[PDB]
From a paper:
The aminoacyl-tRNA synthetases (aaRSs) are essential enzymes playing a central role in the translation of the genetic code and hence constitute a viable target for the development of antibiotics. Based on the structure of the catalytic site, two distinct classes of tRNA synthetases can be discerned. Both classes activate an amino acid in forming the respective aminoacyl-adenylate (aa-AMP) as natural reaction intermediates. In view of their resemblance and irrespective of the class, aminoacyl-sulfamoyl adenosine (aaSA) derivatives are well-known high-affinity aaRS inhibitors, but they lack antibacterial activity due to their low uptake potential. Structural analysis showed the flipped 2-hydroxymethyl-1,3-dideazaadenine base is partially mimicking the interactions of adenine within both series of aaRS enzymes.
For class II aaRSs, the adenine makes numerous interactions with active site residues, with the N1, N3 and N6 all making H-bond interactions with conserved features shared amongst all class II aaRS members. The interaction between the N3 of adenine with the conserved water molecule for class II aaRS enzymes is crucial for the recognition of aaSAs by the corresponding enzymes. It was hypothesized that the flipped exocyclic amine moiety of HMDDA should be able to mimic this specific interaction. Although in the case of AspRS, the position of the HMDDA base overlaps with the natural adenine base, all the original interactions of the N6 as seen for the equivalent aaSA are still lost with AspS7HMDDA, similarly to what is seen with SerRS. Furthermore, the N6 amine group creates an unfavorable bond with the class II conserved structured water. This could explain the more significant decrease in inhibitory activity compared with that seen for class I aaRSs. However, in class II aaRSs, two different base conformations were observed, where the base adopts an anti-conformation in AspRS as seen in class I aaRSs but a syn conformation in SerRS. In the holo-enzyme of AspRS, the motif-2 loop region adopts an open conformation and only changes to the closed conformation upon the binding of adenine-containing compounds. Both HMDDA base conformations in SerRS and AspRS either lose the additional conserved structural water-mediated H-bonds as observed for the N3 of adenine or make unfavorable interactions with structured water due to the presence of protons at the N6-amine moiety. While these values reflect high affinity for the target enzymes, the inhibition is 5 to 420-fold lower compared to that with the original aaSA analogue. This contrasts with the inhibitory activity noted for the congeners targeting class II AspRS and SerRS, as only 9% and 54% inhibitory activity, respectively, was observed at a 200 µM inhibitor concentration.
Author numbering:
A (entry chain B): 0 to 174, 176 to 580
B (entry chain A): 0 to 176, 179 to 432, 437 to 578
Amino acid sequence: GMRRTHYAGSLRETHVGEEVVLEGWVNRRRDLGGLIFLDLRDREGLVQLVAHPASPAYATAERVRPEWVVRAKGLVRLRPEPNPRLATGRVEVELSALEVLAEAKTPPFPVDAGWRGEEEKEASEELRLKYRYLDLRRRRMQENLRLRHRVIKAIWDFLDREGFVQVETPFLTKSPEGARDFLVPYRHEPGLFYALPQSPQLFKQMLMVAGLDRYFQIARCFRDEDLRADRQPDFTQLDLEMSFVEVEDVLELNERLMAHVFREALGVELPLPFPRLSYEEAMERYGSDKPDLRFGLELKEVGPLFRQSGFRVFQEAESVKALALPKALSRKEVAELEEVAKRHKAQGLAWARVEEGGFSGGVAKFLEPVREALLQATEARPGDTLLFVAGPRKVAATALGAVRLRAADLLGLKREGFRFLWVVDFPLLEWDEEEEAWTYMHHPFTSPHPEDLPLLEKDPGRVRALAYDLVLNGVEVGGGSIRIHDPRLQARVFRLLGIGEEEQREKFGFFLEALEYGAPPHGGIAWGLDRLLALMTGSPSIREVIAFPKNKEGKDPLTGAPSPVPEEQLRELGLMVVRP
Amino acid sequence: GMRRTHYAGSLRETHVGEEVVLEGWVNRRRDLGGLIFLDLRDREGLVQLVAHPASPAYATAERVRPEWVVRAKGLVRLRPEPNPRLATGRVEVELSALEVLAEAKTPPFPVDAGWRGEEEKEASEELRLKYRYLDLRRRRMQENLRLRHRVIKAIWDFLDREGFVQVETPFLTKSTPARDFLVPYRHEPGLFYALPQSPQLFKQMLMVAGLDRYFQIARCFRDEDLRADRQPDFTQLDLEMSFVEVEDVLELNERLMAHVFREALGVELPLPFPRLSYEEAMERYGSDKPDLRFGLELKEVGPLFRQSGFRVFQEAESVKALALPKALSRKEVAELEEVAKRHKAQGLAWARVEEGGFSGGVAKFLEPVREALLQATEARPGDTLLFVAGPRKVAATALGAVRLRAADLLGLKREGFRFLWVVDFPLLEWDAWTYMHHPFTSPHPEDLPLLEKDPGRVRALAYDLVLNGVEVGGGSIRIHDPRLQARVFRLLGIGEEEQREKFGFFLEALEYGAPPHGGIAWGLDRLLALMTGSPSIREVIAFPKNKEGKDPLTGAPSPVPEEQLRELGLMVV
Ligand SMILES: Nc1cc(CO)cc2ncn([C@@H]3O[C@H](COS(=O)(=O)NC(=O)[C@@H](N)CC(=O)O)[C@@H](O)[C@H]3O)c12
Ligand SMILES: Nc1cc(CO)cc2ncn([C@@H]3O[C@H](COS(=O)(=O)NC(=O)[C@@H](N)CC(=O)O)[C@@H](O)[C@H]3O)c12
């Protein structure tokens, strides 16, 4: 069997008197009074080795330096003075033998602090990525990756128990998730390309057409996007699909799945069911289709109060949203929120102060005429600051919702735990204020609400969709919808999305024919697995929960990718670089 | 909650008297004696629905057609006579309601027979692939895909219990000089990612990172000849371990495989697996992937003919002998001889075995050494002796292929699953010298001094897992000493510029303390095809490419608009 008898970091007082064999890295060396103290590291933690001058292991111990790999044998004994910061802190290993398995030169950054329970100084991420195999020696990085393992294993356990069949779908396929495709040239016939999948969407629907009933996959998705916050050229999804389901069925199974993951992987109980809010209700109360429920400060609509007002900018406005903050902001803080507000298309930010009887500051003059009804609607108290955005309903909500989020940081609010919610009843379409056009909120295979089918021709903008987003602490972690299983309706919805018979046959012909052979009702969802794991670990970037990620430009400094290729290899594909 | 109360195919006698709601596809319709019989299908199997003339669903049941999607409601009843070919064979559902959820065109091929337990006529695979979503309705295809699920889940359960960490590795990586599938980098035309040939370097770096043991259901991409039932991308079970010897890797993979077969197939694999050195396998079977489902081992008999007048035997480097337990026809022998010649042999000698002597071909030259030849081959009266004389590797390889062909001719029973390890492969082979698998494969430590003196005799710490004459897995212990790795490169004539070009980043990683480590990769698609008795891995892949590497279902690979390609800064030559 293995020479190793225990993991180094797993030794305890119960092992005293036992002879052990250990293998690991030298976390640090310290010589004192002729003794050589070596902190031996493996994935379970640190344990102290002691090399005594009279021991055969001493000569070898004198050569050892940090990050050397060694095999150690000796007796477990109590330390005269225990180190309470270590799980092995009460014991040490009196060495009888020591062998060097590998030498190592000094690393470009330290990996030893985390294993001692000490704080780790910040290191250049570009350098960490260049030496990612060393960065992954740190305790925090291994904790993240082992959490990722526990999460995926819990997903397998739960969904296998629920009858879901894991199916692996192709990576070399044809060119719809609303992004740019990554292409793979077909060598035997230039001009032909595969496309890496933006998602397994159409394959998992065809698996429902095939009668598998319910499917899941830890699928890798590839999307070539530009301006994206914390973008990676590829990412991981928990993808799943179900047949003969309504919206409620997909939601019910997912929250039960999420509760199982958090319980088994984090030991956290998630109260069930998750809170549910419609798209309209979420925008009105929070000005965001991904509300952050870790605090209050809800938005109140104050439009019907200004229909008799001399303030033309309020009285004419479609919407005036107000927010009461429990603090008297400085003009700098107000100006900070005003800049945030203006960045979201608002006409401006109004401000004031709530005082014992009247109002003071900002637009306080215009606040004085109204009060009995207004104070009841906002519950504002002396010492508060009132902020207002007036405008179109969607603008007014979205601008003051971003102000709401920014103000939570300025005020230093304690935002704790994990607050999930479902956002449901999305409109089938979203108005592009920029391009003055209709665009879909979820992919074009989403089912419109069946009660609204006649509105497809009459009034497109009123059509609801059977779509849903899963939100965690103000972040979209998942999204899905009930699909269209009737071929007539799917073409209808394509013609409505500016797609004629030509683009349909070329881009989706195979799938539309599949719907003609008896497709069942079905729907599903996809999680952003990297995103969810980043939130579960309090990481600021998904790069902290991916083993070998790219940097912000989509480059790999460790391997040198992307890189050029020989002219010969490029001619073989029948392609050349366009000369500028 | 859900509308359906049960899976259609899950109903048994225990459900009699219950009112059920079922949803599925119309497998078949029969009108008999005024009753309308509908076979309702879902993934769990068929159940018989019965519409009676008095039932509100009578008219509906009459107009439905095969593959229509329907929701049925009714009372579970015993059949008057059970149909034991259905798991639901004892019961039926008296229809009170029938609702059409989707009509369906006539499929281009049938998908109903297998669900009744009937043989299915072979259909054009191109047609099956073009309508794969219909092909996957067949029972056989759903059983394959669900076995694949149970196998992967069993791998997760076992390796998680043994302390392995699943780690996902990049799909967009560095192109290096097999041919790489490339991915253009939009922001700088002329730069490309590559899809990974394997996770090798990444999993070795995870050992350098101290994770100790890793695994991954990894996808590999290799743009090479697709003949021999190859796909552009395929699935490996890939794992790596630290502080291990060859023994440790084999032992864990044996127990893992036994667990997979037990949980996924209900089959018990005796442990430990047999082991043969590469040399023993070639000597006894003429192949580095022996098929242990039958005997017929090869025997070296060259040293019996050193004083024999028969030139071709006497002067041959090696004479391999094979005893078939049947007297062959003059035709069969010529088929085996043609097989031998097809494998570089000079020919195939033969002779029939009698009670007191020989008779057939070289029988005359065998009588002088009769006693020794029978103790060596254990041949008996009625057998047929076959011989190939020539170079050791040629004679073994040729008669080993004859051995396999003879198994078919004799109609031998080849049943079950026979695993074995092939170990102690040579580290190098002639061309100057070259490696036999990967330049990171560790030499056998007790052969290290031979690395420069006699390279051809250096054993490697490599191993192949073979199932019924098919390689299903392979791996090795890796080099963790950069000084030894440089020593191997010097022996191979691989200069520094070439090392940095191919392995620079990983060679530098060895300088930071790499532990002893090793691993293996299974050909998961190949294994599943063998576990299901399928002739091609296409049968165990949901949406595979055809034999030519193209996807008839979607039409990929297909052209793109010139503006989609212009945006990447590339143009067709
Ligand atoms: N996390 C993450 C990172 C990056 C790096 O640049 C890009 C991402 N692009 C997406 N995600 C995450 O995947 C989730 C689902 O993807 S989806 O496009 O919304 N919907 C679909 O794909 C539908 N086919 C699902 C269905 O309808 O069943 C999002 O909620 C994000 O958490 C990304
Ligand atoms: N099944 C299968 C199908 C196809 C369709 O085109 C192509 C294949 N190419 C390979 N395989 C299967 O993968 C196994 C391991 O792959 S390897 O190249 O030998 N070694 C390695 O890749 C090392 N990284 C492993 C290590 O040393 O740890 C083989 O034993 C085959 O069963 C293929």
